[PDB]
Amino acid sequence: TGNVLKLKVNFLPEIITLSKEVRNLKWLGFRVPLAIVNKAHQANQLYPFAISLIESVRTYERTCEKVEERNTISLLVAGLKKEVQALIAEGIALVWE
């Protein structure tokens, strides 16, 4: 069911591994290839946006539960639905943005 887009932090399964391995080789004096260093540290600095994305995913789950709380939510929640549409477009439907 559903067959739609989703909003969940996707940087998390690799940014900590890249940070630990690359930064450990750095303070270990060892070297890591150019693209790995750049993309790893940039993904780690982008991890704050991924943190906001994880909190937004939790907020999306709580939003579904709150929209499924009782009667008047699903009856008169078109404003929150349009807001969730614009939010899903600005954060989940980003094509290289």
């Binding site: 559903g2 067959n3 739609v4 887009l5 989703k6 909003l7 639905k81 969730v84 549409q85 939010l87 899903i88 477009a89 989940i92 439907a93 094509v95």
Partner: peptide
């Protein structure tokens, strides 16, 4: 926003 997310996915294609 299920249909909205589906519309966004179809618009991105």
């Amino acid at each position: 926003v299920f249909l909205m997310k589906q519309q966004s996915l179809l618009a991105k294609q």
